[PDB]
Amino acid sequence: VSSLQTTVEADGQSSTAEKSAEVTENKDGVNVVDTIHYKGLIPKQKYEVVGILYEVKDGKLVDPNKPITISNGTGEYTVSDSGEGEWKLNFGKIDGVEARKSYVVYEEVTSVENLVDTDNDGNPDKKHEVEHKDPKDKSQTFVVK
Numbered sequence: 001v002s003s004l005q006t007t008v009e010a011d012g013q014s015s016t017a018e019k020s021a022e023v024t025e026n027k028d029g030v031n032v033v034d035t036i037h038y039k040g041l042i043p044k045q046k047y048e049v050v051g052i053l054y055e056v057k058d059g060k061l062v063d064p065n066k067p068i069t070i071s072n073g074t075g076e077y078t079v080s081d082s083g084e085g086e087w088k089l090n091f092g093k094i095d096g097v098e099a100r101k102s103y104v105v106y107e108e109v110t111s112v113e114n115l116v117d118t119d120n121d122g123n124p125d126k127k128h129e130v131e132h133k134d135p136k137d138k139s140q141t142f143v144v145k
């Protein structure tokens with residue numbers, strides 16, 4: 001049993017569940033970072049992260065097949081001893097973040113090792129996969145002025 005909660009930071013402005021960060025169009029691009037608060041991951045195991053930034057309007061993806069940007073971060077993430085903790089994914093300074101529009105971060109977390117036995121043969125045969133893909137999550141959304 002596992003989950004991710006995520007917090008987007010756009011040009012130093014952090015979103016919350018209550019209130020999305022507001023930024024001005026940057027021209028040099030908007031710096032986008034996502035904090036991944038993970039729960040119930042397998043302790044001490046290595047995972048890979050794919051973060052995806054989408055344009056969003058009224059809690060629906062505008063163009064779900066055309067992400068603004070995709071980040072793989074450092075390429076490997078280590079779970080805490082408790083299975084709960086935080087990782088930070090940098091997207092970098094992102095072009096195509098436009099005035100009057102909102103953007104939401106989606107996250108996919110996948111174990112490096114097979115950790116899930118799906119057929120009860122006693123051997124893990126599947127990677128552990130956890131995601132947070134919520135287009136209504138203010139915590140993952142920022143607004144451009």
Ligand SMILES: [Mg+2]
Pocket residue numbers: 116117118119120121122123124125
């Ligand atoms: Mg198996």
